[PDB]
Write a protein that holds these residues in place. Structure first.
Motif, PDB file in Angstrom:
ATOM      1  N   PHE A 147       4.315  -6.424   8.264  1.00 29.34           N
ATOM      2  CA  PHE A 147       3.140  -7.046   8.855  1.00 29.34           C
ATOM      3  C   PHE A 147       2.908  -8.402   8.196  1.00 29.34           C
ATOM      4  N   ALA A 148       2.090  -9.231   8.832  1.00 30.50           N
ATOM      5  CA  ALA A 148       1.800 -10.573   8.326  1.00 30.50           C
ATOM      6  C   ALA A 148       0.772 -10.510   7.202  1.00 30.50           C
ATOM      7  N   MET A 149       0.778 -11.520   6.341  1.00 28.31           N
ATOM      8  CA  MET A 149      -0.059 -11.496   5.144  1.00 28.31           C
ATOM      9  C   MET A 149      -1.552 -11.342   5.420  1.00 28.31           C
ATOM     10  N   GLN A 150      -2.111 -12.171   6.300  1.00 23.41           N
ATOM     11  CA  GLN A 150      -3.552 -12.113   6.531  1.00 23.41           C
ATOM     12  C   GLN A 150      -3.956 -10.757   7.107  1.00 23.41           C
ATOM     13  N   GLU A 151      -3.177 -10.261   8.069  1.00 20.30           N
ATOM     14  CA  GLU A 151      -3.386  -8.929   8.649  1.00 20.30           C
ATOM     15  C   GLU A 151      -3.435  -7.863   7.552  1.00 20.30           C
ATOM     16  N   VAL A 152      -2.458  -7.907   6.654  1.00 22.57           N
ATOM     17  CA  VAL A 152      -2.371  -6.914   5.588  1.00 22.57           C
ATOM     18  C   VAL A 152      -3.611  -6.958   4.697  1.00 22.57           C
ATOM     19  N   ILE A 153      -3.987  -8.150   4.252  1.00 28.71           N
ATOM     20  CA  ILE A 153      -5.138  -8.289   3.362  1.00 28.71           C
ATOM     21  C   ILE A 153      -6.427  -7.833   4.046  1.00 28.71           C
ATOM     22  N   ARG A 154      -6.647  -8.299   5.270  1.00 27.56           N
ATOM     23  CA  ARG A 154      -7.895  -8.022   5.966  1.00 27.56           C
ATOM     24  C   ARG A 154      -7.970  -6.601   6.526  1.00 27.56           C
ATOM     25  N   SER A 155      -6.832  -5.911   6.617  1.00 27.40           N
ATOM     26  CA  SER A 155      -6.800  -4.527   7.108  1.00 27.40           C
ATOM     27  C   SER A 155      -7.314  -3.517   6.094  1.00 27.40           C
ATOM     28  N   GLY A 156      -7.277  -3.878   4.815  1.00 25.55           N
ATOM     29  CA  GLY A 156      -7.613  -2.957   3.743  1.00 25.55           C
ATOM     30  C   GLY A 156      -6.701  -1.745   3.653  1.00 25.55           C
ATOM     31  N   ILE A 157      -5.442  -1.868   4.076  1.00 22.39           N
ATOM     32  CA  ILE A 157      -4.552  -0.699   4.039  1.00 22.39           C
ATOM     33  C   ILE A 157      -4.204  -0.248   2.614  1.00 22.39           C
ATOM     34  N   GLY A 158      -4.525  -1.068   1.614  1.00 19.61           N
ATOM     35  CA  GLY A 158      -4.339  -0.700   0.207  1.00 19.61           C
ATOM     36  C   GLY A 158      -5.556  -0.099  -0.474  1.00 19.61           C
ATOM     37  N   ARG A 159      -6.620   0.164   0.281  1.00 17.12           N
ATOM     38  CA  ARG A 159      -7.891   0.574  -0.320  1.00 17.12           C
ATOM     39  C   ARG A 159      -7.826   1.898  -1.075  1.00 17.12           C
ATOM     40  N   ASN A 160      -6.854   2.749  -0.748  1.00 16.68           N
ATOM     41  CA  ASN A 160      -6.707   4.036  -1.433  1.00 16.68           C
ATOM     42  C   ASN A 160      -5.588   4.079  -2.470  1.00 16.68           C
ATOM     43  N   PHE A 161      -4.886   2.973  -2.706  1.00 16.32           N
ATOM     44  CA  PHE A 161      -3.742   3.032  -3.608  1.00 16.32           C
ATOM     45  C   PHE A 161      -4.150   3.456  -5.016  1.00 16.32           C
ATOM     46  N   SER A 162      -5.319   3.022  -5.472  1.00 15.82           N
ATOM     47  CA  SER A 162      -5.738   3.322  -6.843  1.00 15.82           C
ATOM     48  C   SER A 162      -6.012   4.802  -7.078  1.00 15.82           C
ATOM     49  N   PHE A 163      -6.160   5.580  -6.008  1.00 19.25           N
ATOM     50  CA  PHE A 163      -6.260   7.032  -6.141  1.00 19.25           C
ATOM     51  C   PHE A 163      -5.100   7.593  -6.971  1.00 19.25           C
ATOM     52  N   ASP A 164      -3.904   7.024  -6.793  1.00 20.91           N
ATOM     53  CA  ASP A 164      -2.695   7.448  -7.509  1.00 20.91           C
ATOM     54  C   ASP A 164      -2.876   7.380  -9.024  1.00 20.91           C
ATOM     55  N   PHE A 165      -3.803   6.543  -9.490  1.00 17.18           N
ATOM     56  CA  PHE A 165      -3.990   6.290 -10.914  1.00 17.18           C
ATOM     57  C   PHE A 165      -5.117   7.116 -11.518  1.00 17.18           C
ATOM     58  N   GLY A 166      -5.861   7.875 -10.724  1.00 11.67           N
ATOM     59  CA  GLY A 166      -6.971   8.617 -11.290  1.00 11.67           C
ATOM     60  C   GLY A 166      -6.481   9.506 -12.415  1.00 11.67           C
ATOM     61  N   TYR A 167      -7.218   9.549 -13.521  1.00 13.92           N
ATOM     62  CA  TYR A 167      -6.758  10.345 -14.649  1.00 13.92           C
ATOM     63  C   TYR A 167      -6.477  11.791 -14.241  1.00 13.92           C
ATOM     64  N   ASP A 168      -7.353  12.354 -13.414  1.00  8.68           N
ATOM     65  CA  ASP A 168      -7.245  13.756 -13.003  1.00  8.68           C
ATOM     66  C   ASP A 168      -6.424  13.951 -11.722  1.00  8.68           C
ATOM     67  N   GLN A 169      -5.853  12.874 -11.179  1.00  5.28           N
ATOM     68  CA  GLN A 169      -5.161  12.897  -9.885  1.00  5.28           C
ATOM     69  C   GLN A 169      -3.708  12.426  -9.937  1.00  5.28           C
ATOM     70  N   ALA A 170      -3.341  11.634 -10.941  1.00  2.43           N
ATOM     71  CA  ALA A 170      -2.008  11.046 -10.986  1.00  2.43           C
ATOM     72  C   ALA A 170      -0.956  12.136 -11.064  1.00  2.43           C
ATOM     73  N   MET A 171       0.149  11.947 -10.357  1.00  2.00           N
ATOM     74  CA  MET A 171       1.255  12.882 -10.470  1.00  2.00           C
ATOM     75  C   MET A 171       1.791  12.840 -11.905  1.00  2.00           C
ATOM     76  N   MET A 172       2.304  13.955 -12.424  1.00  2.00           N
ATOM     77  CA  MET A 172       2.501  15.219 -11.696  1.00  2.00           C
ATOM     78  C   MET A 172       1.256  16.105 -11.705  1.00  2.00           C
ATOM     79  N   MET A 173       1.001  16.742 -10.562  1.00  2.00           N
ATOM     80  CA  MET A 173      -0.107  17.673 -10.363  1.00  2.00           C
ATOM     81  C   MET A 173       0.456  19.033  -9.989  1.00  2.00           C
ATOM     82  N   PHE A 174      -0.339  20.077 -10.233  1.00  2.00           N
ATOM     83  CA  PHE A 174       0.107  21.474 -10.093  1.00  2.00           C
ATOM     84  C   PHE A 174      -0.916  22.368  -9.433  1.00  2.00           C
TER      85      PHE A 174
END
Ligand code: FAD
Ligand code: FAD
Lengths: 477, 478
Positions: free
Chosen positions: B203-230
């Protein structure tokens, strides 16, 4: 169904009972071909090899290792992990081979690299390294954005949207600075009551950048490596024992070292030695899955340009060593369940098991290294490989790495009979690769080296399927 | 290990047989105490609840649901995933409860958000969203670096090191541009010979930024959420059935609705109804794990300031709905094995199963939503919840989402008897009210995840139990 039913009587001889050979035989048999597989080893699967108690291997230096892992404990000496897009998973379903998650990313495993910083040789968890790297990266980009540096390419609205993302992604303070994060983890774990725990404090930006602590992060994004990843329960070789059982051992000769392969008036004649005895088989077509560097050693009547093309697929070095520990210290002390620690040391990475979680013992892959960093183990005796692996591992995971060791077992693929390579590296879609996709009269080559997924079972399986399709179309004509 | 053998005869009554109550009872027994657990439900585990064939629940609206999932198929209506640092895993080890990986990150699941771009309401795989977001982010930071914008905070050597990292992290071209990547995945899978496959285009840069498709990426880093999970094989409730078995059903009264809890001369007297009959039990100490908003409803002799403190732990809304499908379309068509799709829609996320990979059927968690986005389901009938879940899910995963549906089952924790909340949020968030409730009220001790720094995690309930048992033991020892 790959192909329809063949009409009449047609035979194929398959050289090699690794993934490509077994897949070829399986699909040909489904369609009604007579098939015979000739496999030099006394096991199916080739570079898919799972070491368990009782596994014995004599390498090309003449050293014999005998694995003594506890019942049910193993590691994959070759293929170990499978991404979601690979046809390998489709074959697991078809064969009834149970799969489980493979831990290919872990916040709690360590990175450890040399640098001209005080982080040199220091173990840092992935979550701490990521929080600091992404924290400072986000701070820097937010600063440049706020400073107006990107005003020619970002509108006011673009800048605001980007800033919002960066504050979240980097866990920045209200004023746009990276000051640390709970994402780094805790020296003391948050508990109950007033036991708040103690956050691990951040490294400085200069430390982070100059240490290269993020050098392995992009591994997580590899098309063939990104989570979720999978592996068969109880070892990767179970796929190939399943193929074996579907094909029928009456149609496979194990311990059959092929010594000659020739186009003849009658089809293709293949000579092989089995049980010390000299044997021959003729079939209408042959599928040769023997690694390309080994094909030239056969008596053959391949044209010179084919022999030259085969030599372009250069052998590669890779190897692993597994240590069974009688205490799962990685889980109990380091809070590591699966995943791998990463390093610039020769060991390259330490891979923690994905099964028997919370049990009393387990096998750790003390190294999985390739290229230069496997050359460093290839010529050592197993005892020397182990000593080096333990020393380097202790520099990452501490003195506990040296204790509670029960047994060990290593493989080095360039030193392994009937492989003599981990995977092909073609000199220079090359002319030689393209040449070898063509049949040599009734001889077809197949294997992962003749694919766009070299060093993946997917490459071998798709190669097999293409070659079977070509044989079937030829028979139809 | 926690405590080493009490001397003489000492008794404890535990109110509630969820994780805190069962852990308390388990540890007290190991130390030699007489313990009795009073649990209102017929099952152990409280907010750890696994729905399977035969589960029947009547919610506070009077609606009864009967789960008919195929044998071996289930989903966790409450607790479902466990990070590596949590003591929950140590109890799984002690109790012999087998665990397996929980897929909490997946490159092949989808994000789908509204925006003022052409990506509005369009599903994008995580790997494509990440490749574009990190590609353009890296391009932009490299551009700023090359321009000299960071010359006051980075040395020449720092800039070169950063540039090297960004080129790799963003998969940039040799001249520093993001032009796409194999990391995005493929519309046709690379195979053998000249079958190279075809990369998905960026996708094009402005579309990507304004879409907010990265808004959930930081979930991966949550102390209690980061892989590996069981998670436990066969359901999170296996932990609490294992506790039950170790404690002994003779020491647990199920179907016991506590109605009164009072400090008395000899300890604590608790009145409860079981088998239709008014009963009473007295013990030297009590551990009360009943959710704090429910404690005030009991007859009691707690001081006024304790009653006030209990009211500061405000209840919250969360719920889930599981659909058993007779075809694992997510695996067979979308190449999704576990993980979750994420959205701004009320459903919030769609969670794919972590068991029975490659099999013939499976349960998908069609929503797991909280707060306002659970309030959108709370007052709906189960049939209405299902219709809404399918409508919203089909907007993310297509028409296949509406097909091959066998059965379904939902829970909404605010509407669930003996819970009436998913977890507590303390007003002013330690708050003074939280601190107050860590103190014994004579012989009554409160315990539960709300009295921890891991609220909404079993770890919080289990560490609370352990701390309270330690306090009681130290007091008994004098
Ligand atoms: C270190 C390593 C890591 C890997 N990692 C992964 C991974 O994680 N995931 C993944 O999917 N794949 C992985 N692979 C790749 C996978 O193992 C290969 O893609 C696959 O085994 C290739 O199959 P093949 O049939 O082309 O060749 P091979 O497996 O090499 O089979 C060739 C067969 O020919 C036989 N043979 C050789 N000479 C003769 C002879 N003279 N007569 C008769 N038979 C003969 C051999 O014994 C062998 O069984 C890995 C491999 C290695 C070595
Ligand atoms: C939607 C949701 C998602 C979650 N996600 C996770 C997760 O993924 N991982 C994780 O680790 N944790 C998760 N949890 C949190 C976990 O479920 C809790 O931390 C844990 O259940 C709290 O235990 P507790 O003993 O404090 O309370 P509870 O589990 O609420 O137990 C209290 C007990 O008291 C009983 N009771 C109530 N009133 C009476 C009465 N009058 N008489 C007798 N008994 C009574 C109840 O029936 C219940 O059994 C989640 C919970 C929910 C609801």
């Amino acid at each position: 169904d790959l192909i329809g039913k063949v009409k009449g009587s047609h035979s194929v001889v398959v050289l090699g009972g690794g993934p490509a050979g077994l897949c070829s035989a399986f699909e040909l048999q489904k369609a009604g071909y007579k098939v015979t597989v000739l496999e030099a080893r006394t096991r199916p699967g080739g570079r898919v090899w799972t070491a368990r108690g009782g596994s014995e291997e004599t390498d090309l230096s003449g050293e014999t290792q005998k694995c003594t892992f506890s019942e049910g404990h193993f590691y994959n000496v070759g293929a170990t992990r499978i991404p979601q897009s690979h046809i390998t998973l489709d074959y697991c379903r078809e064969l009834g081979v149970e799969i489980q998650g493979f831990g290919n990313q872990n916040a709690n495993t360590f990175v450890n690299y040399q640098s001209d910083t005080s982080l040199s040789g220091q173990s840092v968890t992935y979550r701490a390294a990521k929080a600091d790297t992404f924290g400072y990266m986000s701070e820097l980009l937010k600063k440049a954005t706020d400073q107006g540096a990107l005003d020619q390419v970002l509108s006011r609205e673009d800048k605001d949207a980007l800033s919002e993302f960066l504050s979240d992604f980097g866990d920045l303070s209200d004023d746009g600075r990276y000051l640390g994060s709970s994402r780094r983890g805790y020296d003391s774990e948050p508990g109950a009551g007033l036991n708040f725990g103690t956050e691990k404090k951040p490294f400085a930006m200069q430390e982070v950048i100059r240490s290269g602590i993020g050098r392995n992060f992009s591994f997580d994004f590899g098309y063939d490596q990104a989570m979720m990843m999978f592996t068969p329960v109880g070892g990767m070789d179970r796929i190939y024992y399943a193929f074996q059982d579907r094909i029928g051992t009456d149609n496979i000769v194990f311990g059959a070292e092929v010594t000659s392969m020739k186009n003849v008036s009658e089809g293709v004649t293949v000579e092989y030695t089995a049980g010390g005895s000299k044997k021959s088989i003729t079939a209408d077509y042959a599928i040769c899955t023997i690694p390309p560097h080994l094909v030239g050693r056969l008596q053959n009547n391949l044209p010179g340009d084919v022999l030259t093309a085969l030599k372009a697929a250069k052998p590669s070095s890779s190897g692993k060593l597994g240590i069974e520990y009688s205490r799962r210290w990685w889980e109990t002390e380091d809070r590591i369940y699966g995943g791998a620690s990463n390093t610039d040391k020769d060991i390259s990475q330490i891979m923690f098991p994905y099964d028997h979680y919370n049990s009393d013992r387990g096998v750790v892959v003390a190294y999985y290294s390739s290229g230069k960093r496997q050359e460093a183990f290839e010529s050592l005796t197993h005892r020397q490989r182990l000593a080096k692996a333990i020393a380097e591992g202790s520099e990452i995971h501490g003195e506990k790495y040296t204790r509670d060791i029960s047994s060990s077992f290593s493989g080095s693929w360039r030193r392994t009979k009937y492989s003599e390579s981990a995977w092909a590296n073609w000199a220079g879609a090359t002319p030689e690769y393209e040449k070898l996709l063509e049949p040599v009269d009734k001889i077809y080559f197949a294997g992962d080296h003749l694919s766009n997924a070299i060093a993946w079972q997917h490459g071998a399986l798709t190669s097999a399927r293409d070659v079977v399709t070509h044989i079937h179309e030829r028979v139809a004509q």
